[PDB]
Write an enzyme that holds these catalytic residues in place. Structure first.
Site, PDB file in Angstrom:
ATOM      1  N   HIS A  68       0.854  -1.223   0.000  1.00 36.19           N
ATOM      2  CA  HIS A  68       0.000   0.000   0.000  1.00 36.19           C
ATOM      3  C   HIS A  68       0.877   1.256   0.000  1.00 36.19           C
ATOM      4  O   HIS A  68       0.744   2.103   0.898  1.00 36.19           O
ATOM      5  CB  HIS A  68      -0.995  -0.060   1.159  1.00 36.19           C
ATOM      6  CG  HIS A  68      -2.111  -1.011   0.903  1.00 36.19           C
ATOM      7  ND1 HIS A  68      -2.167  -2.254   1.488  1.00 36.19           N
ATOM      8  CD2 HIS A  68      -3.187  -0.914   0.093  1.00 36.19           C
ATOM      9  CE1 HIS A  68      -3.249  -2.874   1.072  1.00 36.19           C
ATOM     10  NE2 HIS A  68      -3.888  -2.078   0.204  1.00 36.19           N
ATOM     11  N   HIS A  72       1.955   1.517  -5.758  1.00 34.58           N
ATOM     12  CA  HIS A  72       0.548   1.056  -5.895  1.00 34.58           C
ATOM     13  C   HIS A  72      -0.306   2.229  -6.383  1.00 34.58           C
ATOM     14  O   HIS A  72      -1.098   2.054  -7.340  1.00 34.58           O
ATOM     15  CB  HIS A  72       0.036   0.464  -4.580  1.00 34.58           C
ATOM     16  CG  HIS A  72      -1.435   0.228  -4.554  1.00 34.58           C
ATOM     17  ND1 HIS A  72      -2.025  -0.795  -5.248  1.00 34.58           N
ATOM     18  CD2 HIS A  72      -2.430   0.858  -3.897  1.00 34.58           C
ATOM     19  CE1 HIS A  72      -3.322  -0.800  -5.007  1.00 34.58           C
ATOM     20  NE2 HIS A  72      -3.601   0.208  -4.199  1.00 34.58           N
ATOM     21  N   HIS A 106      -5.833   7.383  -3.435  1.00 31.89           N
ATOM     22  CA  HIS A 106      -6.893   6.491  -2.892  1.00 31.89           C
ATOM     23  C   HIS A 106      -6.401   5.753  -1.643  1.00 31.89           C
ATOM     24  O   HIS A 106      -7.256   5.296  -0.872  1.00 31.89           O
ATOM     25  CB  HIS A 106      -7.444   5.533  -3.957  1.00 31.89           C
ATOM     26  CG  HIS A 106      -6.636   4.294  -4.134  1.00 31.89           C
ATOM     27  ND1 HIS A 106      -5.462   4.287  -4.838  1.00 31.89           N
ATOM     28  CD2 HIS A 106      -6.823   3.036  -3.688  1.00 31.89           C
ATOM     29  CE1 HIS A 106      -4.952   3.066  -4.815  1.00 31.89           C
ATOM     30  NE2 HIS A 106      -5.773   2.276  -4.125  1.00 31.89           N
ATOM     31  N   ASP A 107      -5.098   5.626  -1.431  1.00 29.71           N
ATOM     32  CA  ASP A 107      -4.558   4.874  -0.263  1.00 29.71           C
ATOM     33  C   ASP A 107      -3.596   5.762   0.551  1.00 29.71           C
ATOM     34  O   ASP A 107      -2.791   5.209   1.305  1.00 29.71           O
ATOM     35  CB  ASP A 107      -3.875   3.579  -0.701  1.00 29.71           C
ATOM     36  CG  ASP A 107      -4.784   2.359  -0.819  1.00 29.71           C
ATOM     37  OD1 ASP A 107      -5.746   2.232  -0.033  1.00 29.71           O
ATOM     38  OD2 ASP A 107      -4.491   1.511  -1.675  1.00 29.71           O
ATOM     39  N   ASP A 217      -7.915  -0.754  -8.665  1.00 29.76           N
ATOM     40  CA  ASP A 217      -7.304  -1.073  -7.357  1.00 29.76           C
ATOM     41  C   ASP A 217      -6.803  -2.513  -7.348  1.00 29.76           C
ATOM     42  O   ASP A 217      -5.778  -2.779  -6.676  1.00 29.76           O
ATOM     43  CB  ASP A 217      -8.295  -0.855  -6.226  1.00 29.76           C
ATOM     44  CG  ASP A 217      -7.607  -0.721  -4.885  1.00 29.76           C
ATOM     45  OD1 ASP A 217      -6.391  -0.481  -4.875  1.00 29.76           O
ATOM     46  OD2 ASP A 217      -8.304  -0.830  -3.873  1.00 29.76           O
ATOM     47  N   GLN A 269      -5.681 -17.743  -3.647  1.00 29.10           N
ATOM     48  CA  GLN A 269      -5.734 -16.904  -4.875  1.00 29.10           C
ATOM     49  C   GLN A 269      -6.926 -17.346  -5.741  1.00 29.10           C
ATOM     50  O   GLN A 269      -7.660 -16.451  -6.204  1.00 29.10           O
ATOM     51  CB  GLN A 269      -4.390 -16.922  -5.611  1.00 29.10           C
ATOM     52  CG  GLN A 269      -3.318 -16.108  -4.894  1.00 29.10           C
ATOM     53  CD  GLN A 269      -3.679 -14.644  -4.809  1.00 29.10           C
ATOM     54  OE1 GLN A 269      -3.777 -13.942  -5.819  1.00 29.10           O
ATOM     55  NE2 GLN A 269      -3.930 -14.179  -3.592  1.00 29.10           N
TER      56      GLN A 269
HETATM   57  C1  J0O Z   1      -4.397 -10.452  -5.129  1.00 32.30           C
HETATM   58  N1  J0O Z   1      -5.060  -9.396  -4.376  1.00 32.30           N
HETATM   59  N2  J0O Z   1      -5.186  -8.126  -4.808  1.00 32.30           N
HETATM   60  C2  J0O Z   1      -5.830  -7.416  -3.826  1.00 32.30           C
HETATM   61  C3  J0O Z   1      -6.180  -8.286  -2.708  1.00 32.30           C
HETATM   62  C4  J0O Z   1      -6.951  -7.872  -1.494  1.00 32.30           C
HETATM   63  O1  J0O Z   1      -7.668  -8.655  -0.817  1.00 32.30           O
HETATM   64  N3  J0O Z   1      -6.899  -6.543  -1.071  1.00 32.30           N
HETATM   65  C5  J0O Z   1      -7.275  -6.109   0.311  1.00 32.30           C
HETATM   66  C6  J0O Z   1      -6.150  -5.034   0.233  1.00 32.30           C
HETATM   67  C7  J0O Z   1      -5.718  -5.627  -1.156  1.00 32.30           C
HETATM   68  C8  J0O Z   1      -5.661  -9.560  -3.104  1.00 32.30           C
HETATM   69  C9  J0O Z   1      -5.727 -10.903  -2.438  1.00 32.30           C
HETATM   70  O2  J0O Z   1      -4.899 -11.794  -2.668  1.00 32.30           O
HETATM   71  N4  J0O Z   1      -6.808 -11.077  -1.624  1.00 32.30           N
HETATM   72  C10 J0O Z   1      -7.154 -12.263  -0.921  1.00 32.30           C
HETATM   73  C11 J0O Z   1      -8.487 -12.509  -0.454  1.00 32.30           C
HETATM   74  C12 J0O Z   1      -8.864 -13.654   0.254  1.00 32.30           C
HETATM   75  C13 J0O Z   1      -7.891 -14.607   0.501  1.00 32.30           C
HETATM   76  S1  J0O Z   1      -8.005 -16.074   1.367  1.00 32.30           S
HETATM   77  C14 J0O Z   1      -6.283 -16.360   1.056  1.00 32.30           C
HETATM   78  N5  J0O Z   1      -5.701 -17.525   1.528  1.00 32.30           N
HETATM   79  C15 J0O Z   1      -6.369 -18.166   2.658  1.00 32.30           C
HETATM   80  C16 J0O Z   1      -5.815 -19.603   2.789  1.00 32.30           C
HETATM   81  O3  J0O Z   1      -4.409 -19.542   2.988  1.00 32.30           O
HETATM   82  C17 J0O Z   1      -3.697 -18.928   1.906  1.00 32.30           C
HETATM   83  C18 J0O Z   1      -4.240 -17.543   1.526  1.00 32.30           C
HETATM   84  N6  J0O Z   1      -5.638 -15.413   0.366  1.00 32.30           N
HETATM   85  C19 J0O Z   1      -6.530 -14.374   0.040  1.00 32.30           C
HETATM   86  C20 J0O Z   1      -6.132 -13.209  -0.665  1.00 32.30           C
HETATM   87 MG    MG Z   2      -7.272   1.039   0.067  1.00 34.02          MG
HETATM   88 ZN    ZN Z   3      -5.403   0.500  -3.192  1.00 31.42          ZN
END
Ligand code: J0O
Ligand code: MG
Ligand code: ZN
Length: 313
Positions: A68, A72, A106-107, A217, A269
């Site tokens: 962040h 980004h 935005h962040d 985003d 993922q």
């Molecule tokens: C790729 N990406 N881009 C933005 C974001 C994002 O969520 N945001 C919030 C600020 C950025 C993500 C992302 O990877 N998000 C994400 C969501 C649910 C799960 S559950 C999980 N596993 C659980 C089981 O164990 C392994 C990981 N890994 C993830 C990863």
């Molecule tokens: Mg944000």
């Molecule tokens: Zn962002």
């Protein structure tokens, strides 16, 4: 007036593509952003001196966190640039001005922690803003920088145009709260399928700008596999630090933030692409057909994560 920014040939060409990576040379990122404002908005949109001073104050107010961060900010602004350039006639002069600035801001002053963590920590910001905690902070920081002497890049707008642009920026930054994304996309889905979607309806435009904000985003998932994979490391580095901090409050973090469950990342993922990314770019492509390359790149990356699970990498 007659002072354009010009990028090297490879950048001049690739910057127009959705999958462009802004590169590891931090000192070029401001010039890349001004280049995008000048082609997206015009060389007259902002007083160059005021714009440069706004850009460097925004940069200064992003922190040295793994994801962040300032990189980004500029990456999310480039994805918005790509969407706007591929949808020339759909957006007003004020929207083009507002949205590149919204993406850059935005962040602002992100600490690398979710809204959840602020609430469980009982952070002062969680008492000042009960929902979209960090996002209301990000907008607040944006208005602050806009009110530094010499930083008002909107000074040549009328009083009412000024209020419209700050309102565009506010809604656009609030919409980057992913908790608001699910309901926003469901509504956009229904409106599109029942044929009631109307881009002259301001409340409808707001929803569509919100989805664009989610799409920009999340754009890490729309890059070439090597960029997507290495960005995922930065994302998880923040999540696992938050996990550690959850444990320090005596709370087992969700698996997403537990570094003891590194093994489960590929499957995590998948869920994220299926539950958030694919649906996001699907609905965006339905409303804005020229954004299809984002959906195509997302699907390619889903397939790459499936290959990691199958032990083919
Ligand atoms: C790729 N990406 N881009 C933005 C974001 C994002 O969520 N945001 C919030 C600020 C950025 C993500 C992302 O990877 N998000 C994400 C969501 C649910 C799960 S559950 C999980 N596993 C659980 C089981 O164990 C392994 C990981 N890994 C993830 C990863
Ligand atoms: Mg944000
Ligand atoms: Zn962002």
């Amino acid at each position: 007036g007659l002072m354009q920014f010009t990028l090297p040939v490879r950048l001049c060409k690739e910057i127009e593509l959705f999958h462009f990576d802004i590169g590891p040379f931090e000192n070029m990122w401001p010039g890349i952003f001004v280049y995008m404002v000048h082609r997206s908005c015009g060389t007259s949109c902002f007083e160059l001196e005021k714009l440069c001073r706004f850009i460097m104050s925004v940069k200064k107010n992003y922190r040295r966190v793994p994801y962040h961060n300032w990189k980004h900010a500029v990456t999310v602004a480039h994805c918005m640039y790509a969407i706007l350039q591929n949808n020339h006639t759909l957006f007003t002069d004020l929207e083009r001005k507002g949205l590149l600035i919204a993406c850059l801001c935005h962040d602002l002053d992100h600490r690398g922690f979710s809204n959840s963590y602020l609430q469980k920590f009982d952070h002062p910001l969680a008492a000042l803003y009960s929902t979209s905690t960090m996002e209301q902070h990000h907008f607040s920081q944006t208005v602050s920088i806009l009110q530094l002497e010499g930083h008002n890049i909107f000074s040549t707008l009328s009083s009412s145009e000024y209020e419209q642009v700050l309102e565009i920026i506010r809604k656009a930054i609030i919409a980057t709260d992913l908790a608001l994304y699910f309901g926003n996309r469901k509504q956009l889905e229904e409106m599109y399928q029942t044929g009631s979607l109307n881009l002259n309806n301001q409340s409808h435009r707001d929803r569509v700008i919100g989805l664009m904000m989610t799409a920009c985003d999340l754009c890490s998932v729309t890059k070439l596999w090597p960029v997507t994979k290495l960005t995922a490391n930065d994302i998880y580095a923040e999540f696992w630090a938050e996990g550690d901090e959850m444990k320090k409050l005596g709370i087992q973090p969700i698996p997403m933030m537990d570094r003891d469950k590194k093994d489960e990342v590929p499957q995590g993922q998948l869920g994220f692409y299926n539950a958030v990314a694919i649906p996001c770019y699907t609905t965006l492509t339905q409303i804005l057909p020229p954004t299809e390359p984002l959906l195509k790149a997302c699907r390619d990356n889903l397939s790459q994560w499936e290959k990691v699970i199958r032990g083919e990498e």
